[PDB]
């Protein structure tokens, strides 16, 4: 009493509800900056003119 | 590895002025002849 430990245990279980089932959730964040970029696209290059 | 270090010189830590440092540039674009 008084003092609860954060840490809590998921009940996850193959028969739960739709919405307490797991889901992996991956976020990825986006950043622009004048340097250089080096995450590009499939895109292919040309020559320049 | 840790050893203690008793042979410290107490003293108040002194201040100076900073002038005019610390100017840094703030951004990776390039300008010329320009008041930014």
Do not use: M
């Given at each position: 009493?008084?003092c609860?430990?954060?840490l809590?245990?998921?009940?996850?279980?193959?028969?739960?509800?739709?919405?307490?089932?797991?889901?992996?959730?991956?976020?990825?964040?986006?950043?622009?900056?004048?340097?250089?970029?080096?995450?590009?696209?499939?895109?292919?290059?040309?020559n320049?003119v | 590895?840790?050893?203690?270090?008793?042979?410290?010189?107490?003293?108040?830590?002194?201040?100076?002025?900073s002038?005019?440092?610390?100017?840094?540039y703030?951004?990776?674009?390039?300008r010329?002849?320009?008041?930014?």
């Open positions: 009493f008084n609860y430990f954060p809590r245990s998921y009940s996850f279980r193959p028969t739960y509800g739709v919405g307490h089932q797991p889901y992996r959730v991956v976020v990825l964040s986006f950043e622009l900056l004048h340097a250089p970029a080096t995450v590009c696209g499939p895109k292919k290059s040309t320049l | 590895q840790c050893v203690n270090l008793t042979t410290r010189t107490q003293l108040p830590p002194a201040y100076t002025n002038f005019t440092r610390g100017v840094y703030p951004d990776k674009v390039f010329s002849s320009v008041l930014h």
